[PDB]
Amino acid sequence: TFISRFAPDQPRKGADILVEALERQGVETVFAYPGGASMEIHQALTRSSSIRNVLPRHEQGGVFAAEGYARSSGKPGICIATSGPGATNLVSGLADALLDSVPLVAITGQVPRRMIGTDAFQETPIVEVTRSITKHNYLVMDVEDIPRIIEEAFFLATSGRPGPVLVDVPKDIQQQLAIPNWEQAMRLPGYMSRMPKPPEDSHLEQIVRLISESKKPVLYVGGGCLNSSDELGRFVELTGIPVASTLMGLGSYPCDDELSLHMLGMHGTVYANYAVEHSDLLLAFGVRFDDRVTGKLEAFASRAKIVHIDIDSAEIGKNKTPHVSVCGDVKLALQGMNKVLENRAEELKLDFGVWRNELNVQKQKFPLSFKTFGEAIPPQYAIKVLDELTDGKAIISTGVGQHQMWAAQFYNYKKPRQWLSSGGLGAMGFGLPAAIGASVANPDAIVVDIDGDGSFIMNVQELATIRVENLPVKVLLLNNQHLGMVMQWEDRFYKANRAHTFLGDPAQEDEIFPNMLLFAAACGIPAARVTKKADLREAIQTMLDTPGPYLLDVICPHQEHVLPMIPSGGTFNDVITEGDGR
Amino acid sequence: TFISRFAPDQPRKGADILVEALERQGVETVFAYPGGASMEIHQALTRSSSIRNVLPRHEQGGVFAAEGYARSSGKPGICIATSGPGATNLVSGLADALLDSVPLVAITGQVPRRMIGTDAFQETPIVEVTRSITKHNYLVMDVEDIPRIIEEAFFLATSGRPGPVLVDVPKDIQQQLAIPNWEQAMRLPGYMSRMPKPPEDSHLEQIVRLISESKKPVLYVGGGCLNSSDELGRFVELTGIPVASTLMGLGSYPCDDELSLHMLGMHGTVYANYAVEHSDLLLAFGVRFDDRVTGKLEAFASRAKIVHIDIDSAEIGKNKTPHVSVCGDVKLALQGMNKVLENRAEELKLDFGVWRNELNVQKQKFPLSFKTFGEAIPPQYAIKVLDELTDGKAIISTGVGQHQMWAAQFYNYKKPRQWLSSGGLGAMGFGLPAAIGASVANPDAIVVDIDGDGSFIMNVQELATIRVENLPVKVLLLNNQHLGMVMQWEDRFYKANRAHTFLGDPAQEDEIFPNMLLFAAACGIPAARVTKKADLREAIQTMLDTPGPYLLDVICPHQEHVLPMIPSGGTFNDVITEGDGR
Amino acid sequence: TFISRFAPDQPRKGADILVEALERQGVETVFAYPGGASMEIHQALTRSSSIRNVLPRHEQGGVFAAEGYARSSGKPGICIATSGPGATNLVSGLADALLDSVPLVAITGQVPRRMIGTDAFQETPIVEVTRSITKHNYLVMDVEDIPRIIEEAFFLATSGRPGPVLVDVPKDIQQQLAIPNWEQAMRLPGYMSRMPKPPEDSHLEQIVRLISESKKPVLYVGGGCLNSSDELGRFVELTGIPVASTLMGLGSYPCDDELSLHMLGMHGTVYANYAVEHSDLLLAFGVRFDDRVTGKLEAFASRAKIVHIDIDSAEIGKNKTPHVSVCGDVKLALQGMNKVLENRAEELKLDFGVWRNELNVQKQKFPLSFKTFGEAIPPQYAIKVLDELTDGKAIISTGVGQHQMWAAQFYNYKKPRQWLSSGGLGAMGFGLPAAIGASVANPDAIVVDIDGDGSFIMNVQELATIRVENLPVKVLLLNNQHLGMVMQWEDRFYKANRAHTFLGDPAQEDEIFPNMLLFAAACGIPAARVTKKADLREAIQTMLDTPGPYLLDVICPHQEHVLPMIPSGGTFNDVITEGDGR
C-alpha cells in the first residue's frame, strides 16, 4: 500500500529512513528549525512530497505549534530541532505536553555518537534533561533502530494517556547508509501488558446502579473525554445528570445547554462548585483531581460517592480516594453504560429534576457576571462578542492568566479540540504558536488566539511565521498593560503592592506600550486598535472578515478581576464573588 | 559592617531572608520575571533598596541578560523565575552558562513542599531537569537553609571553573517566618579539598625551561585567561611568543598587536592555525581543546610538546594528552613564570624572531580578507567600521552564525569582558539580551549587539526591556534574510540545496522581511536601514551618536561565506580559503 | 523522662549522638559487625548500657537477624556495618526487607566526607546502590543532622507501609564533637500529607452492604493484617466468611479453625484457590495481588466484586483493578466494619453456610496430603510432629524452597509474628540468622528454624553467633541433599535433567554431604541425625527438651514434590495435584 521513494534493496541515509518512518506513520506536517546537527534531516525532508514543514522563528514556537496542531486535530504533533540550544528550546513545550497529556513526538539532532559526553560543539544531554518531562525518550545508537524507535515513539505518544516522546538522533547515524526493515516488532512488553482492557459489565452496571440510588449526582468531566463527545452526550440524555467541566474538558459537553454547569474549580462558576460541594454521587470522567479544581481535598465532594474512570491507573486514588473506580477508556465505559441505561431504562426511571432545580436557582442567583465602566471595553464582553460573531464555531487558543480564564468563561465551545489552552504547566506565549498549529491542522477553520499583552509578546516572533505561511490566524489581544493574574493576586493578598507586574513604559505611564500594531506591521499583518466598547463589534467583525492574518489590539482597564475565585487550598465557603482592583 | 533591615531577633519571611542573602553577597541587580510560585520573592525584592530588578519579557531573556551581566563584569549573574514554565524557560541559559563557564546563580520558585511530586499546578522537577546542565543545584527544604545554600551557590558559581548554580525554593518556605543565621558554615568538604593550590615553582620552572629549548613556541589562549590580561601581557613581552586565541579568549591579548595571531580553529586565521600546526611547543592556557579548534585531534599540534594549564583537572588530558600539565589558576602560573623569566632573563636570552618571521610571511600571504561587490554592504566592512568609529572600546555581544564569526574576526578587542558571545552551546537569540545585561553592568560603556536577522528575532521581545530600562543598547543588525551558517554549509556540502534556511517571505522574494525597523518602532526605539556601502559610516556614526537605544538594519548580500574554513574533523591541509555562495 | 549520659551542654562525638539517638528511639538491640569506618560507632556502643549488640559472623547474617528481630516483635530491626564490603553485604537484607515490608533501620559507616567520590579505601556509593532497594536512605553530611535523620529513619521505617531505611554516616562526622538538639522537627512534609487518614464510614458501610448482598464471599488476607489479629478474628465471627491467607499473612487467622481455608496461591490448598476462583466477593485485606497468588490475573477472582484495603495507594489497582477500595490501615477498617456489623446485625442476618459447605466438601475431597514410603522420613510429617510437640506455639523461621512451603503448609500458626519467612525476594540463608533475631526479641520463646540443606549452609557461620550469644535456637534441618524447588521444576518441566541441583558429593553419591552435625560440633552446639520415621518423635522431643541451641539433621527422600501446584502464570484449572520425582 505505502509507496516508498527508494528501492526495497537500495541503501539510503538514516535521515531518509527517519523521514520515511514519519510518512509511514501518516505524518503530513512537522515544525522544524534547521541546525547543524539536524541538517541531514532537513535535507531528507525536502525530498519528501507528502510532508510539509512549517519553519518557526523559535524552537519553542515550533513545539507550541506542534501542540496546537495535536490539540486541535487529535493526531500527534511533530517538531524537529537541532542539537544543544535547539533541543533545550523545546523543554517548556515537552513539559507542557506531558502535563496536559498531549500526543507529541519531538525529534532532535545530536552530535556524532563518538563525541557524546565530551562537551562537544552544541552538545546537550537532552535525553537526560528531558527524562522527567516526557512520557518517554530515546537516544538512537544505530541507524538500524530508526524504524522501530519511530514506530514505538508514535505508539507511546498516542496510546493510553497521550504524551510527548523525544527521539535523539546522532548526526553520524543520520548519514549512515542502510536498508530499513519496517517489519520489526516494537519492544514494549511491559507497556503493552499494562494497557487497560475494555471495561467489564460488572463494574459498569454497579455504576448505573449507584446513579439510580443517588439524588444529587454530578458529572465531573475533564480532558480525558475529548474523544467521547457523542458518548458523553448520549449518557447525559439518558441520565439527566448536570455536567461540570475542567479547564481541559471544555467543549466535551456543549457549554450552551441547560444541563451544563460550565467550569468548576478555582475560577469555576459558583453553581458548578456548589453542585460538587453538595453532590452525593461524583462521576469523575477523564479528570485528575487537580489542586486547581479541588482546593482542599478533604472538603472536595466530601458528601458523596466518587466514581473515577481513568486510562491511567497511577491517577486513580492519587489525590482523592474513590469509592468505585474503572481503569480504562472512558469512551468505552460510556458506550457500555449507555446500553445498560437504554435497556433497563423503564425499570430505572431516572429523574433528578429536583436536584437540577436546586442548581438552577444557584445558576440564577450566582451567574457569571461582569461590570461595564463608561465606554471602557470589558474583556469579558469582547470575548462574548467574538462568540456571537463566530457563532461559537472558532478554534480558540490562548495565553495564560486572566484573559485565559475569561476565554474559558465567556465563550461557549460546541465541540472538543476547539479549546487550545495550557492548563497544567500554564505556559505563557503558548497562544500564538498554538494557533499556528491549529490553523495548519484546520485550514478552513476560524482560528482566533485570545492573548494577553504579556503572553503575546513572549513569542511575538511567530508573527513572521504566520505571514510567510499565509495562515488566517486572528489575534484578539486583550491588552491591559499588566501581568493580570499576578496583579490580581497582588490586589487580593499583597495590599496591591505592585512588584514588576506592569508591562508598559513608566516614563509614559498612560501610553500603550509596546505598540502591538507595529509588531504586526513589521510582519505585514493588518492590525487595528479598539478602546471604546461601542466600536468593538465592528472591529471584531472586521478582523473576522478581513482575509488572512489579523491582529486586533483590544484595550481593557487593568483593574478587572477574574471571578468568582476560591483561593488556593480553599473551600467552597471561601469563594470570593466580588471586588476588583479599583 | 552589613546593615540589615530587620532586627537581629526579628523573624521574617524566608523570601526576605533570601533577598538579604543576596544583598550580603553584594548583589545589586537581578533579572526576574514574576510568577505565582515566586510572588513572595518579588515582594521581598521591592523592600530592598540596594537591589534593582530588570524585568525581562521572557525568562530566557532574563537568563541571557544575566549571562551578559556576568560575562561583561566578572561578577555572577542572577536571574529569578517562577515555577514550571518560568523555570523551564531558563534551561538554554543554564546549559549555555555551563558550557562557557559563566558564573551564574538562578533562583526558581517551586510549588509548596508537600505538593512536590503530585503534578501540582505549574510544577516541574527543575532540579532533576537541570542536574546535567548546571554546575550544581539545590532544592531548599527548610527556611533555615536559605542562608547557607545561597552562600554555597555563589561560592560554587564563582570559584574554580565558574558555572551556573540553580536554587529551587518552595513557596511555603518563602512564607515561613524565621530568624536567619549568617554564621553557618558551608557544607562543601569535597569541593574545598579539591580546590587547586597555588602552582609549584618546580612545575613553572620546567615550563620556562621548555620555552628556552623550543624554537617554534605558540601560545594557545582561551576563556580561562579572561582575568589574566596583565599577567599574559607581561608573559608575552618576556618571551616574545606569538599568541593564538580561541573564540572565548578574544581580548585576553590585544588583537591589534604584531605578536597576535588572532583566532585559531575552524574559522581561525590561516597563520594562527599554521603556527599551531608547525609549533614545537604549545602553551595551552585556559583552553579546553574543543573540536572546533582542534579538528582531528591526532593532527592537532602533532609536532610539539603540549603544556596545559587548567583550573579543572577533568579537562587536563580530556581530548589531548599533555606532555606537561599544571592544574591551577593560570593567573598565578603566569605571575610565577613571569618572575622566573625576569630573573633568569639574561641567562635565557629568549629570541623567537626566526619563528615570528616564518609566521609573519604567512600572516602576509594569507590574511583575513573580504570582497566588495558594487555598492553592496560587506558585513566584514561594517564591523570593521564599527571598530574604527568606536575605537575598539565597545562591549560587543552577538548572536550565533556568520555574523558572529565576522564580529570575532573583524573587531579588535582591547580587553577581556568586551566580547560576549555564546561559544560552547552557540545559542541563537543570545545577543540582544546579553547586551542588556552588559549595559546594566557597564552604564557608561558603548554596548553594541552585532546580531543576525534570525538570532535577533528569537528574543526580539527584549526590545521592550531596553526601552523601559532606558539602556543605550545599539543593535548592528547584519541582515542577510537567511540562516547564514546553515546556508553556507548547504552551499559547501549539499549542492546549495536550500532547506528551510530562508527567513524572508517567498511571496515577495526581494522584499526585506520582516521589517526590523517596525519592531524597533513598536518599542519606541529609533532605527534606520542601510543598503549602500557608501552610507555605512554615516549610518553607524548616527547610531553611535544618537543618545539611547538604536537599531541599525544593515542589509548584506547573503552569498557571503565565512573564511577561512576547516571542515569539521578536518586538518590544516583541509582549510578552505576561497569561494562563496555565488 | 529520658536520662542522657552527657550534660545538656556538653559536646560529644557524633558517634555518641547517633547512639543516644537510638536509645531515645527505644532501641535495645542492634546487630553490628565492626569495621574501620564504623569503629567510632562501636566504641560509642560500648558506652551504652541499654543497648546490647549481637555480633554476627557476616553482615548478611546481621541484616537477616535484624529482620528476624523485627518480623517476630513488631519493632524495627537495627543493623550496623562498616563502609564498602560491610555495606554491600547488607544489600540482600535490604532488598528482602523492602519486598516484605519489614521495618528496618540500617546504619553504615562511610569514608570521611572529603574523600567521598575519590575511590577511597573501602568506599562504596551505598546510598546510590541502595536507592532502589530501600524505602528511603540518607547520607549524613553534618553531625548536626544526626538527631533529625535518625528520628526520620525510624519514623519512615515504621510508619505507613513498613520498610528498610539506610543511614550513611561519614567517619569524620562520627568524630565531630557537638551538642545535639533533640527538639528538631522532621522534614517530611510530602510523606506526612500522604499518610492515610482513618477510614470513612461511608466506605465501610458500602462494604458491609456488599457482604450482605454476596452469596460466596472469601477473605484474602495478607502480610498487612499482622497487627489486626483480634480485629480480623472478630470480623470473621460476625460475618462467617471463609479465610484464605497468603504466605506473608499466615497466622493472622488461626490455621486450626473450621473457617480457615489456609494458604492460597501457587502452592495453596485446592479449596482456598477454589474459594477464590468461584467467589462473588473477594475481600483483599493487606495483600498485594502477587503473581505467586494470582497466576493469570484475568482468571484470578474473575467472577467477583473485589474490595481492596491497603495502606499503600500505589498498590490499589496495581495488578488487579478493584470494584471498591479503601486506602488506609486495615486494622481501623476492621474495627469500623465490626461496629457496623454488631449493630445492624439482626437486620443483616448474615449466613454463608451454603458457601461454607460447598467449600468444606472441597476441603474434604482435596486436602493437603503426603505419602509415607517404608521408614523414610516424610518432611511434611516431621513438621507436623514439631507442631504437635510444640503445641503450635513456636516461632518458626525458614529458608527458601520446598521445606519452606511445607513449613507453611503443615504447621498451624496461632498468631502473627510466629511465621518468619522470606516471601517476596525469597532469599536463601535467611532462616538461621532470622531465628537468631527472633530469639533475642523473644528470649522465652521456642524458636525453631526449619531449614533446607542448601539454605542452611549459606549462612552456617551464624552457628558461632548462636553459641556465643547462648540463644536457645533449634534447627530442624530437612536434609534432602538437593536444591529441592529447582529440582522439582526440573522434574516437571525439564524431563528431570539435573543441572547443578545436587548438593552432595558425586564421589560418594550415597553419603550425606556435608555432615551438618560437624558444623554444629565446631560451634559447640549439640546435634543429632534422624533417618527412620520411627525415631522422629523422640528425636524432635530431644531437640526441644535439650536446653540451649540444638541441630536436628532430618534426612528426607529428595523425590518429594510440593503439592498442590499451579504452574507460573497458570489458572485454577491448571492445578497439579499428584506426582513426584519418582
Ligand SMILES: Cc1cc2nc3c(=O)[nH]c(=O)nc-3n(C[C@H](O)[C@H](O)[C@H](O)COP(=O)(O)OP(=O)(O)OC[C@H]3O[C@@H](n4cnc5c(N)ncnc54)[C@H](O)[C@@H]3O)c2cc1C
Ligand atoms: C491561570 C490558571 C487557572 C486555572 N484555573 C482552573 C480552574 O479554575 N478550574 C479548572 O478546572 N482548571 C483550572 N486550571 C487548569 C488546571 O491547571 C488543570 O490543567 C486542569 O484542572 C486539569 O483538568 P483535567 O484533570 O480534567 O484534565 P487533564 O489534566 O488533561 O487530565 C486528564 C486525565 O484524564 C485521563 N484520561 C486521558 N485520556 C483518557 C481516556 N481516553 N479515557 C479515560 N481517562 C483518560 C488522564 O490520564 C488524566 O488522569 C487553571 C490553569 C491555569 C494556567
Ligand SMILES: Cc1cc2nc3c(=O)[nH]c(=O)nc-3n(C[C@H](O)[C@H](O)[C@H](O)COP(=O)(O)OP(=O)(O)OC[C@H]3O[C@@H](n4cnc5c(N)ncnc54)[C@H](O)[C@@H]3O)c2cc1C
Ligand atoms: C558558529 C560557531 C563557530 C565556532 N568557531 C570557532 C573557531 O573557529 N575557533 C574557536 O576557537 N572557537 C570557535 N567556536 C567556539 C567554540 O565552540 C568553543 O566555545 C571555544 O573554542 C572554547 O574555547 P576555550 O576552550 O578556550 O574556552 P572555554 O570553553 O571558556 O574553556 C576554558 C577552559 O579554561 C579553564 N579555566 C577557567 N578559568 C580558569 C583559570 N582561572 N585558570 C586556568 N584555567 C581556567 C576551564 O575550566 C576550561 O577547561 C565556535 C562556536 C560557534 C557557535
Ligand SMILES: Cc1cc2nc3c(=O)[nH]c(=O)nc-3n(C[C@H](O)[C@H](O)[C@H](O)COP(=O)(O)OP(=O)(O)OC[C@H]3O[C@@H](n4cnc5c(N)ncnc54)[C@H](O)[C@@H]3O)c2cc1C
Ligand atoms: C518458593 C516460594 C513460593 C511461594 N509460594 C507462594 C504461594 O503459593 N502462595 C502465597 O500466598 N505466597 C507465596 N509466596 C510468597 C509470595 O512471593 C509473596 O511474598 C506473598 O504472596 C505476598 O503476600 P502479601 O501480598 O499478602 O503480603 P506482603 O507482600 O507483605 O504485602 C502486604 C501488602 O499489605 C499492605 N499493608 C501493609 N501494612 C498494612 C496495614 N496496616 N493496613 C492495610 N494494608 C497494609 C502493603 O503495603 C502491601 O501492599 C512464595 C514465595 C517463595 C519464596
Ligand SMILES: COc1nc(C)nc(NC(=O)NS(=O)(=O)c2ccccc2Cl)n1
Ligand atoms: C559552525 O559550525 C557548524 N555549522 C553548521 C551549520 N553545521 C556544523 N556541523 C558540524 O560540525 N557537524 S559535525 O557533525 O562534524 C559535529 C561535530 C562535533 C559536535 C557537533 C557536530 Cl553537529 N557545524
Ligand SMILES: COc1nc(C)nc(NC(=O)NS(=O)(=O)c2ccccc2Cl)n1
Ligand atoms: C491562577 O492561580 C494562581 N495565580 C497566581 C498569580 N498565584 C498563585 N499561587 C498559588 O496557587 N500558590 S499556592 O502556593 O497555594 C500553589 C499551590 C499548588 C501548586 C503551586 C502553587 Cl504556587 N496561583
Ligand SMILES: COc1nc(C)nc(NC(=O)NS(=O)(=O)c2ccccc2Cl)n1
Ligand atoms: C588498614 O587500614 C585501616 N584499618 C582500620 C581498622 N581502620 C582504618 N580507618 C581509617 O583508615 N580511617 S580514615 O577514616 O582515616 C579513612 C581514610 C580513607 C578512606 C576510608 C577511611 Cl575509613 N583503616
Ligand SMILES: [Mg+2]
Ligand atoms: Mg496582561
Ligand SMILES: [Mg+2]
Ligand atoms: Mg542571517
Ligand SMILES: [Mg+2]
Ligand atoms: Mg534441599
